[PDB]
Amino acid sequence: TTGRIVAVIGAVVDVQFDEGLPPILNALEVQGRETRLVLEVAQHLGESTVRTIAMDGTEGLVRGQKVLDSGAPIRIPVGPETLGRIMNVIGEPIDERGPIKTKQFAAIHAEAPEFVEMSVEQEILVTGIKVVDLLAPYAKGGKIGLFGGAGVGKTVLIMELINNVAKAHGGYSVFAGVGERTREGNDLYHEMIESGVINLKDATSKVALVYGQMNEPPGARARVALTGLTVAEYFRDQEGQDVLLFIDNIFRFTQAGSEVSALLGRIPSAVGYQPTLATDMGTMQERITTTKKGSITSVQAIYVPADDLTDPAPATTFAHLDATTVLSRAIAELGIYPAVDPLDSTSRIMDPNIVGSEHYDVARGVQKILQDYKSLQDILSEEDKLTVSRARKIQRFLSQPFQVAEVFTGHLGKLVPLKETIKGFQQILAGEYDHLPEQAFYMVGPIEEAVAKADKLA
Amino acid sequence: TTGRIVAVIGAVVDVQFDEGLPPILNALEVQGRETRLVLEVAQHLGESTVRTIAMDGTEGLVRGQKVLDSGAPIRIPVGPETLGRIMNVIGEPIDERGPIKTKQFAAIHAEAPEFVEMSVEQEILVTGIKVVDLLAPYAKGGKIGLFGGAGVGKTVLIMELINNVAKAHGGYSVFAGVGERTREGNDLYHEMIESGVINLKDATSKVALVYGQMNEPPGARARVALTGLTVAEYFRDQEGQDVLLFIDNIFRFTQAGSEVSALLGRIPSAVGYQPTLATDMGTMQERITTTKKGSITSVQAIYVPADDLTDPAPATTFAHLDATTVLSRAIAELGIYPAVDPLDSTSRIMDPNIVGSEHYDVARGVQKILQDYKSLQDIIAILGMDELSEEDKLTVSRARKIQRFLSQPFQVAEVFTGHLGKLVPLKETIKGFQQILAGEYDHLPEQAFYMVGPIEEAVAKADKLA
Amino acid sequence: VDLEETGRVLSIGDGIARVHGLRNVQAEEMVEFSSGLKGMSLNLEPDNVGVVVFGNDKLIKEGDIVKRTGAIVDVPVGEELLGRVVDALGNAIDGKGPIGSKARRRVGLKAPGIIPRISVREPMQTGIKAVDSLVPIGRGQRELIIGDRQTGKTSIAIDTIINQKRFNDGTDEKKKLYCIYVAIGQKRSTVAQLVKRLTDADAMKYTIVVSATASDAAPLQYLAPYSGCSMGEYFRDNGKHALIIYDDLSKQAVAYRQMSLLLRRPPGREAYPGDVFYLHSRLLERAAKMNDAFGGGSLTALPVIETQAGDVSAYIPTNVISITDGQIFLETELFYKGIRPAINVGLSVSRVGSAAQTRAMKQVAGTMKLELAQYREVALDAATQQLLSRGVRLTELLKQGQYSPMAIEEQVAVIYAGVRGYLDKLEPSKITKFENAFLSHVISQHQALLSKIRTDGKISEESDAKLKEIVTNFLAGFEA
Amino acid sequence: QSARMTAMDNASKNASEMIDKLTLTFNRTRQAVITKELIEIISGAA
């Protein structure tokens, strides 16, 4: 049915319908405008009028302008054809390559999996990255808080994750830019092309891109994480995959929700956040989980407002996180890449019960010896000298050449299997390689290459 | 005649009347409830409609439900047969012992004693609690307030005072439970049966109990203090006798008011409180008083939200008191019980012309050394005591011994301290702190002064150590 | 058409539906929406009824028909719920089919007054040494579990549930403890993992799980504790004993604050409504111990509160402390050091539990309480050298793994060794190893003494002298 | 020299614990200021 605009106040538009009203969350299509303008129903105001949030600018709108009820929430292209493409919150291509020709479309508002669909199986999603797999492993269906600003190799880590998960497991990735800076959205796209995770010439792309740029209205930036989620849900629920979902930034998801709540006249809660802060977060996060079909695992870049970890935004987000990856400038300036702080990064599945007994012991041994090395930095005996040289070789063996940084450097990038990582750090703790030099452990893959780097350079 | 309910939201019920409108404060009776449901008229809204506050839950009420005007405010039993009994906000027996057959009733709203009725008599009431007796003594017929955050020692202190004052007292007591633990009422009731201050077989009971606890909706919690007061007012005026009134906890009165105010649609005041916080408190507190006609020694436990003494509730309560005992969480965490802040507890009778120069001098001397210790906390927290001058080290050592000698085992807290309770005569309290200030025990270890009664116990304790 | 029994939605979109009609609806009556959602009549106004919706409001539209149920908001109760996972309304979410419960209780029923009660006297055994010895819990008591995120809060509750298996396998209904775990605001995966754990431990059969998770509407999270509590009261009022865990009340308060701000009620501290204390007070008051005339049953509650950075002085933490009968405080710093359970002994309190401790435990734990209180200021001269030596070994006995809660007599045996001085010559780093070796010895060899302590609830002179010889002879046998 | 080493080790530890305590007070105050200002604005608007 066709309604009529009765109010326009910024990105808030009221629409009157003569017959049956569109349910809350339904997408409405504004008639007679150059590009596509979607309005999402937020409230039934009474007297046949609904209040909506606009997905694009509202300038030029006239009272009485015709509006079409689509019959459903925002529906976007889902399938293999999303891989390598960039779409917006309403599923339109924004890479100037034409339609995204999927054989299915899906609603962006979808209930989180039910209790009966839950998997109790705790499984490590092997990334093939030594720092991560050993000390702060990712859990299938889990959420990982990615910390650190820029210049700490964030994007290269992201691209290698996409590369590795597709290579090792056979699962695809989805990148949701929530409040994406248009300049940085362009950079990321072309960097992904260079690394090979996006291929413009064939169907081998490993990521689907979903962008909600900063200059878009609150409604668009609030819903774009859901759009990305919906693309990921196809690969899990229709193709049985272990999918990766990147959300850059989770705070900007919260911020956009606060702005939408403000625009709808809802009274702000503590610190100015929306009263629906926790439910806004929960209805989104709970869709990221392990089910019987597969799993969506999510890496979420975290901004901490005012560096206050007790701020409602990070505090509410932390409730949903299972692990952290802390990218550090101090680790970067030491030349160790990835620049992951091996002591600050933690994981809930670092447990002798979930991961192997062999996994837990070695990782606890690596943690202890790195902390003890920092203790001995202030100040040695034969036992202390042995723990110092062991730890310095451990610091270097945590570094890794990436497959994504192969054309830039020329150095062969490495994907290291889990058991190869565990036994590598196990052979250093035992002092089996304290017979061999130190810098042979810097920027290598499996331990067999560190032995060969000592065999060649002797 | 009859009214009809037109609106219900929590404790607030609007009622329309066709003939004759009940004045503000009248008790209305809701028809058809299993247990008596009283609505108190708060406002006239216009169009023959009144806004009321319920004294019990409003679940099950329907628009159009009949309401009758009782022609009076809430009236409760008052007199000798309230003694040994427990009543609720509306004066109903809640002890399963049948009717309270008093000869008289009284409205729970009465006007405060006038200025002409005031007594200026100021006589010390010795508690046997060292901190109180020394620094901020209570007065007979005086208004006492016990300030404290969650779990710091308000109720233990009020219970120790009931133990130390009431038995030495010759008269009646009234305990009003206001928005506190129902199980604390059960404890008190049965302990009073065991001790015999409540007798179920005879007319010899010396205590009347009134309860409206934290299981109650806010209308009940806002009014139950008035119910308690009314019972005490009778004993003060119509018997001209010395009355003790204990209230745990009077903050709950103001908090309940905040809950109803939110439902009445008032524009809120600071920190979300009712705009009427101070006047509501004044109209209630001004009734809790000694008059020329009779004495009320009142002790009110005063909860402190988020430990914030500047919160409008506790902040407005101070000026209603003659003596204040302010408890501190920091002090409790150091192990000092009772957790009294010796530099934030005051009394109107702390006056050399009242307590004598010796008492006054030792008190002020103790407070000086404690304040001198306090304003060194910045440097001590960083560098420790070893950086201070010899002069300052001496003041720190004595202040720490005084801090400990201010602690005391309570008869009531024996399970928690592990020590037999102690009650110290005033003269012994003065002498003990006098000797410490003089440096007579500079040689003794600090821990010797911890959790003792008289100073001799600190000497004996040090002798066992070395 | 029937404006007395039915109404039409006027507006919806702030968690509240405004409904025209329903002239005969009661305050706090459950109503039913066309879509199948339930709601509570909150606001009775002259021209409309304000309805709180127990589900997503996308499912309600202007014009939708709303029907009276005639019933004040209630839930199914009974033994049929044992072994089941239900949502806040008591509907099965575990796919195990219909729940047979015929009886129902109002979720908002006021707690028993003064007279129906009696002092808590019966032990509610957690099987956790630190708790049962130093912070004892009685049946009827409310004991707050409080601490920062990931400090071991839920683990306390889970081990307590698992512990009851030994009584529940018996035939004496008075000794049994039926359990209710209320999940509020949690991840669905977390709850699923929880039931799996309970099932593996054969504890699910005496447990009801009520779940309103992170993606459930705020009014469902608000409701969940009250629903679970009513399911608990069924046992309390049937002369039996139930234990309820509210995990957690911080998230419930957040849910209520959402509802309250959307209703435009005036906020105060941290934007919470003025009735946020009452929200928790009316709930926890319902955990109670009943006198014999009322059947002698009980409901024990373990509410959970999450602190930010160890700050117990904040609004919601202090509110709940001012309600419960003590707290178990879990500390991040202790958890970080490897102290598990991460219980701060000195800061933890049981206000009413000592009367609900067996005499056997009362004995050895009172002297441990003394020996730890004398250790929390000395933590070298010989006078304080003994106080430090004893305190570190006692602290080692307070360490415990998960999922193996201990019989009270087994707890009394291990604490006995440290208190009487059978660990003094052994090094602190080897106490944990000694304990497990000592426990398997007393279980395998001396069942007669452990059985007698369990039955008598006391260590007599015969039991004390007999136990003296066993620990002496094992200490000589224990080498490395 | 031993005693200075000792005292300064303890002072640096006390400073650390005070930094944490003060940072927590700072951030509670920081949040409270924002919340209070907003409640005054909302009350004026309503």
**DSSP states along C163-225:** HTHHHHTSS-TTT--EEEEEEES--HHHHHHHHHHHHHTT-GGGEEEEEE-TTS-HHHHHHHH
Task: Phi first, then psi: give them for residue B399, nearest 5 degrees.
Answer: -60, -40
Q: CATH 1.10.1140.10 in chain A: give the residue spans.
A: 350-458
Residues C399 and A363: their CA atoms lie apart, in Å, by: 23
Q: Residue A267: closest CA among chain D residues belongs to which residue?
A: D42
Please name the member of A45, A51, A112 whose beta carbon is closest to the beta carbon of C215.
Answer: A112
Residues A299 and A249: their CA atoms lie apart, in Å, by 10
Tokens encoding C235: 């046992």
Q: How many CB atoms lie within 10 A of CB C144?
A: 25
Q: How close C239 gets to chain A, by Cα (Å)?
A: 33
- Among the listed residues C121, C265, C351, C376, the single catalytic one is C351
Structure determination method = X-ray
How many CB pairs below 8 Å do chains A and C form together? 130
Q: After which residues do gaps appear in chain C, with C to N over 2.5 Å?
A: 379
Tell me the nearest-neighbour CA distance from C269 into chain D, angstroms. Answer: 8
B308 CA: distance to closest CA in chain D (Å): 13
Q: Of C27, C269, C369, which has the smallest distance from its Cβ to B306's Cβ?
A: C269
Site from C278, C286, C316, C344 to mutate, B interface, most B CB atoms within 10 angstroms: C278
Smallest CA–CA distance, residue C366 to chain B, in Å, is 9
> Is B154 a residue of the active site?
yes
Q: Note whether D18 contacts B381, CB cutoff 8 Å.
A: yes
Under an 8 A CB cutoff, do C309 and D24 touch? Answer: yes
CA angle B399, B403, B406 (to 5 degrees): 135
Distance of alpha carbon B234 from alpha carbon B46, whole angstroms: 36
**Where in chain B is CATH 2.40.10.170?**
1-73
Does A111 contact chain C (CB < 8 Å)?
Answer: yes
| Residue A152 among known ligand-binding residues | yes
Assign domain B350-466 to its CATH architecture: Orthogonal Bundle (1.10)
Q: How far apart are CA C396 and CA C432, in angstroms?
A: 6
**Measured between CB atoms, does C194 come within 8 Å of chain A?**
no
Q: Exposed (0-12), middle (13-18) or buried (19+): which is C399, by Cβ within 10 Å? A: middle
Of C264, C268, C311, the CB nearest to D24: C311
Inter-chain touch D31–A271, beta carbons under 8 Å: yes
Dig out the tokens for C273 from the structure: 């409504």
Could C188 and A116 be called an inter-chain contact, meaning their C-beta atoms sit closer than 8 Å?
A: no
Does residue C60 sit in the same domain as residue C111? no
Q: Is the CB of B151 inside 8 Å of chain D's CB atoms? A: no
Q: What's the gap in Å between the CA of A267 and the closest CA on chain C? A: 6
Alpha-carbon gap, residue A314 to B346, rounded angstroms: 44
Interchain contact D25–A (C-beta under 8 A): no
Q: C218 and C333: one domain?
A: yes
Choosing from C33, C51, C71, the residue where a domain stops is C71
CB distance from D30 to chain A under 8 Å?
yes
Q: A36 with A91: CB under 8 angstroms?
A: no
- Residue C218 sits in the same domain as residue C278: yes
- β A104-107/A124-125 pair status: unpaired
Q: Nearest C-alpha of chain A: how many angstroms from C187?
A: 7
Catalytic residue among B40, B180, B216, B233: B180
Q: Top-level CATH class of A350-458?
A: mainly alpha
Q: At what angle do helices C359-373 and C382-397 cross, to 10 degrees?
A: 130
D-facing residues of A in 348-367 (CB < 8 A) are none
Chains B/A: 3 or more C-beta pairs closer than 8 A? Answer: no
C187 and C133 housed in the same domain: yes
A229/A219 Cα distance (integer angstroms): 16
User: C266 to chain D nearest CA, in Å?
Assistant: 8
Does C187 contact A109 at a Cβ distance shorter than 8 Å? no
Q: Which residues of A242-251 are buried (b: 16+ CB within 10 A; e: fewer)?
A: bbbbbbbbbb
Residue A26: DSSP 8-state: E
Contact C266 D43 (CB under 8 A): yes
A231 vs A248: CA distance, rounded Å? 16
Q: Taking CB atoms and an 8 Å cutoff, what residues of chain A touch C309?
A: 310
> What is B74-349's CATH number?
3.40.50.300
Residues of chain A with CATH 3.40.50.300: 74-349
> Cβ of C273 under 8 Å from any chain B Cβ?
yes
DSSP C26: P
CA distance C141 to C123: 10
Residue B50, amino acid: V
Domain span at residue C128 reads: 72-357
Which residues have a Cβ under 8 Å from the Cβ of B117 and sit 6 or more positions away?
B291, B292, B293
Task: Judge whether A89 and A95 are in contact, CB under 8 Å.
Answer: no
C185 interfaces chain A, CB cutoff of 8 Å? yes
Please indicate, yes or no, whether residues C325 and C362 belong to a single structural domain of this protein: no
**Which among A51, A270, A282 is the nearest to C215, CB-wise?**
A282
Q: Is B439 part of any known ligand binding site?
A: no
Whether D15 and B379 have beta carbons less than 8 Å apart is answered as no
Which of D4, D13, D39, D41 has the highest number of chain B CBs within 10 A, making it the mutation to test binding with B?
D39
**In angstroms, what separates the C-alpha of B190 from chain D's closest C-alpha?**
43
From-to residues of CATH 1.10.1140.10 in chain B: 350-466
- Between strands A143-147 and A295-301, the pairing is parallel
**Nearest CB to A115 within list C93, C149, C267:** C93
Q: Which two tokens stand for residue A267?
A: 């009274």
Residue B197 counted as an annotated binding residue? no
Q: What distances in angstroms separate CA B268 from CA B274, B381, C164, D36, one per listed residue?
A: 6, 41, 49, 13
- What distances in angstroms separate CA C205 from CA B318, C167, C168, C297, one per listed residue? 55, 13, 10, 20
Q: Check the CA dihedral B145-B146-B150-B155 and report its sign.
A: negative
B382 has a chain D CB within 8 A of its CB: yes
Resolution (A): 3.8
Q: Which positions ≥6 away from B356 have C-beta within 8 Å?
A: none
**Cα distance between residue A112 and residue C216, in whole Å:** 9
Residues of A catalogued as catalytic: 154, 180-181
Do C183 and C311 share a structural domain?
yes
Among C71, C97, C126, identify where a domain stops.
C71
Adjacent-strand bridge partners of A340: A327
Q: Is B210 helix (H, G, I), strand (E, B) or coil?
A: strand
Among C119, C278, C321, whose Cβ lies nearest the Cβ of B151? Answer: C321
Q: Do B465 and C383 touch (CB under 8 A)?
A: yes
Across C19-30, b (16+ Cβ under 10 Å) vs e yields: bbbbbbbbbbbb
How far apart are the C-alpha atoms of C8 and C23, rounded to whole Å? 12
Contact status of C278 with chain B (Cβ, < 8 Å): yes
CB atoms within 10 A of CB C192: 23
Q: Do C213 and C122 share a domain, yes or no?
A: yes
Residue A388, Cβ neighbours under 10 Å: how many?
16
CB-CB neighbors (< 8 A) of A311 in chain D: 31
Nearest 10 degrees: CA dihedral of C273, C274, C279, C281? 150
CA–CA distance, A412 with A414 (Å, rounded to integer)? 7
| Residue C171, φ and ψ in degrees, nearest 5 | -120, -5
**CB-based contact D38 A308, cutoff 8 Å:** no
How many separate domains does chain C show?
3
Q: For the domain that residue C386 is a member of, what is the CATH number?
A: 1.20.150.20
CB distance from A112 to chain C under 8 Å? yes
| Mutation choice for A interface testing from D38, D42, D43 by most A CBs within 10 A | D38
Q: Chain D within 8 Å of C267 (Cβ-Cβ)?
A: yes
User: Which residue on chain C is closest to A318 by alpha carbon?
Assistant: C149
A180 labelled ligand-binding = yes
Q: Which C residues in the span 130-159 are in contact with B, Cβ-Cβ below 8 Å?
A: none
CATH 2.40.10.170 fits A1-73, yes or no: yes
Domain finish residue from C39, C71, C103: C71
Is residue C351 part of the annotated active site? The answer reads yes
- Tell me A327's DSSP state: B
Q: Which of C264, C271, C309 sits opposite D35 (nearest CB)?
A: C271
DSSP secondary structure letters along B289-333: S-BTTB-EEEEEEEE-GGG-TTSHHHHHHGGG-SEEEEB-HHHHH
Chain C contact present for B45, CB below 8 A: no
The response to whether A185 counts as a known ligand-binding position is: no
